[PDB]
Design a protein around this ligand. Structure first.
Ligand SMILES: Nc1nc2c(ncn2[C@@H]2O[C@H](COP(=O)(O)OP(=O)(O)OP(=O)(O)O)[C@@H](O)[C@H]2O)c(=O)[nH]1
Ligand SMILES: O=P(O)(O)O[C@H]1[C@H](O)[C@@H](OP(=O)(O)O)[C@H](OP(=O)(O)O)[C@@H](OP(=O)(O)O)[C@H]1O
Ligand SMILES: [K+]
Ligand SMILES: [Mg+2]
Lengths: 143, 163
């Protein structure tokens, strides 16, 4: 494959987390890298291409309780409840496709690492009316 | 009809403006794209799935990630930016020489034609080193993304040339 790792040099934060799927609600262990207003995740630390990319545009973070996983938080859009979060993930053949998430539920290995991740992600959110403008205009004419 | 499109180019070239002019029928005031935008646009019986990837320096090593499955490349250039045209040329050829991009037809949007002294399509053809490339299917479409001039013409070319 291609080594794309210059993209991830000197990140804001990195670490292992468990994440819940979009349509199919399965948990997966993923290596996350937060950098340049994007949250990336990988299957293995040795991967040179991301499994997923989440541009951090007008998202918020909330603590949630989960019956089976500890130290959970969610990424969500407060202004457009129920609307799909922009993201992409890689299919088996390497083709990038759009994500299906309305939220990203994530479990951290300790409450300390949860706090670190929430603080870091909040600091890295790109906030701008532009994103809300796009969502609103798109929804008005979607067919 | 269906077509997967990858839209690339230097930061500030006009990629996102073009995307939403097509998707929303209107010129919007953009901000720099930190990751990507993706939209599906129906135009004259073809659905174009368009991936607009951020063109900032730091993001470019990630462009290769988006190659797989690409059927058409749209490469957008700021025609008023003579300081960075050679940089745009270098990036374009890196893209089209990639093993995953060998079959992609190439649409160049020679964008910002509204600006004084903006490079014309014939100059862009020369400056992007397209004249040498005689074994690929490419076209330089003059455009002004903010007025919409040339955008439908570009999509028309894609439909006409995609095999
Ligand atoms: N004068 C003029 N300005 C344009 C034209 N098209 C886009 N712009 C402006 O150029 C600036 C950058 O345009 P964008 O669409 O955001 O450029 P981009 O390629 O998406 O940049 P990145 O998101 O960093 O990759 C914006 O202020 C646009 O309004 C044009 O045809 N003429
Ligand atoms: O592995 P299985 O059990 O088949 O389930 C998959 C994984 O949970 C994927 O996570 P990952 O990409 O980390 O491998 C997820 O993609 P996301 O990355 O978008 O969460 C898929 O979501 P949907 O495609 O929405 O069902 C889901 O179908
Ligand atoms: K890929
Ligand atoms: Mg953009």
């Amino acid at each position: 494959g291609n080594d794309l790792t210059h993209t991830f040099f000197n990140p804001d934060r990195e670490g292992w987390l468990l994440k819940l799927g979009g349509r199919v609600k399965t948990w997966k262990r993923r290596w996350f890298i937060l950098t340049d207003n994007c949250l990336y995740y990988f299957e293995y630390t040795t991967d040179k291409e991301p499994r997923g990319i989440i541009p951090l545009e007008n998202l918020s973070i909330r603590e949630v309780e989960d019956p089976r996983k500890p130290n959970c938080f969610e990424l969500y859009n407060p202004s457009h409840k129920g609307q799909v979060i922009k993201a992409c993930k890689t299919e088996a053949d390497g083709r990038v496709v759009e994500g299906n998430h309305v939220v990203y539920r994530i479990s951290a290995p300790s409450p300390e690492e949860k706090e670190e991740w929430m603080k870091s992600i909040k600091a890295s959110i790109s906030r701008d009316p532009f994103y809300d403008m796009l969502a609103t205009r798109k929804r008005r004419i979607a067919n | 009809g269906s077509m997967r499109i990858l839209m690339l180019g230097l930061d500030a070239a006009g990629k996102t403006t073009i995307l939403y002019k097509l998707k929303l029928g209107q010129s919007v005031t953009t901000i720099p794209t930190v990751g990507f935008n993706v939209e599906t646009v129906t135009y004259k019986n073809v659905k174009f799935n368009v991936w607009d990837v951020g063109g900032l320096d730091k993001i470019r090593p990630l462009w290769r990630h988006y190659y797989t499955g690409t059927q058409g490349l749209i490469f957008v250039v700021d025609c008023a930016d003579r300081d960075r045209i050679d940089e745009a040329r270098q990036e374009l050829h890196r893209i089209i020489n990639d093993r995953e991009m060998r079959d992609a037809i190439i649409l160049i949007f020679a964008n910002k034609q509204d600006l004084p002294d903006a490079m014309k399509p014939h100059e862009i053809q020369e400056k992007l080193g397209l004249t040498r490339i005689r074994d690929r299917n490419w076209y330089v479409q003059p455009s002004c993304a903010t007025s919409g001039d040339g955008l439908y013409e570009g999509l028309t070319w894609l439909t006409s040339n995609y095999n």
